[PDB]
Amino acid sequence: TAKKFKVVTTFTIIQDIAQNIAGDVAVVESITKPGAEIHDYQPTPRDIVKAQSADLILWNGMNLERWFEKFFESIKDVPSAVVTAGITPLPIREGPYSGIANPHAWMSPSNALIYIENIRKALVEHDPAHAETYNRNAQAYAEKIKALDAPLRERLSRIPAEQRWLVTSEGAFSYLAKDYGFKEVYLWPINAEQQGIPQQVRHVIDIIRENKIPVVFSESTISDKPAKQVSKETGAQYGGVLYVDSLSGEKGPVPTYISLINMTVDTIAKGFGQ
Numbered sequence: 614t615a616k617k618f619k620v621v622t623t624f625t626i627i628q629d630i631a632q633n634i635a636g637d638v639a640v641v642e643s644i645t646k647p648g649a650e651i652h653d654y655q656p657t658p659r660d661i662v663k664a665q666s667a668d669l670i671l672w673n674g675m676n677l678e679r680w681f682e683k684f685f686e687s688i689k690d691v692p693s694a695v696v697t698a699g700i701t702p703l704p705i706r707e708g709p710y711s712g713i714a715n716p717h718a719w720m721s722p723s724n725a726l727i728y729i730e731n732i733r734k735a736l737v738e739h740d741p742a743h744a745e746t747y748n749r750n751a752q753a754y755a756e757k758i759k760a761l762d763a764p765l766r767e768r769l770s771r772i773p774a775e776q777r778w779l780v781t782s783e784g785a786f787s788y789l790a791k792d793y794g795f796k797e798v799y800l801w802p803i804n805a806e807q808q809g810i811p812q813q814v815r816h817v818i819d820i821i822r823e824n825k826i827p828v829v830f831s832e833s834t835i836s837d838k839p840a841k842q843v844s845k846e847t848g849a850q851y852g853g854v855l856y857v858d859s860l861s862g863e864k865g866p867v868p869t870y871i872s873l874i875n876m877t878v879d880t881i882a883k884g885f886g887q
């Protein structure tokens with residue numbers, strides 16, 4: 614066991630999934646820090662250094678990392694793989710990014726099985742000496758992720774179907790909302806320039822009042838102020854922060870992808886009174 618194979622991912626969700634497949638034979642690091650906003654992140658010369666010293670680079674695609682392709686052309690002779698191949702996208706519904714793929718495909722546990730398989734294939738292709746380890750680690754982790762779905766599905770099924778309105782800040786939850794049958798309401802369709810402008814806030818306020826939706830949420834990499842303004846003006850409680858675009862730090866409450874899905878579903882269910 615000389616040097617461990619080095620994998621660099623764009624953001625922390627992919628880091629944790631990939632590290633479970635890598636096990637003990639590769640080290641996986643994320644370019645972005647826990648808590649950092651990932652869509653419009655601005656890479657630095659230190660990020661270039663980290664990617665250039667990798668043996669493999671992994672990114673989401675599906676219009677997530679607006680910085681990645683320009684960043685990756687600075688990198689020489691390091692292979693890359695997009696980990697969302699074979700996932701059917703949901704289009705963004707409005708705004709300047711309307712009609713392109715919503716990147717947040719990892720919020721569906723069923724989609725996460727495809728993430729696992731794509732990362733396994735990339736590690737097996739670019740580090741073939743360790744293929745048996747990657748294959749065994751991916752099979753074990755996919756078992757965990759597959760078993761994850763049933764308790765989450767049952768928990769959220771407790772909410773009456775016509776009350777399943779998921780009101781968030783970024784429209785980051787479309788794939789989870791589809792899996793578990795929630796109608797989707799958000800203050801902005803995807804992180805970008807405008808986030809909590811008027812018109813956005815008022816439309817969401819209107820939908821909450823018409824349907825008496827009991828709760829509204831924010832997310833861990835953006836500002837909680839728009840969601841709190843929405844809850845102040847309506848009958849909705851502020852349900853707290855959901856995790857979607859980043860893990861917490863390793864010593865925080867959301868250290869892993871599994872903990873992210875569990876925590877987001879728990880916080881939603883609690884917002885509806887379980």
Ligand SMILES: [Zn+2]
Pocket residue numbers: 652717783785804858
């Ligand atoms: Zn996002």
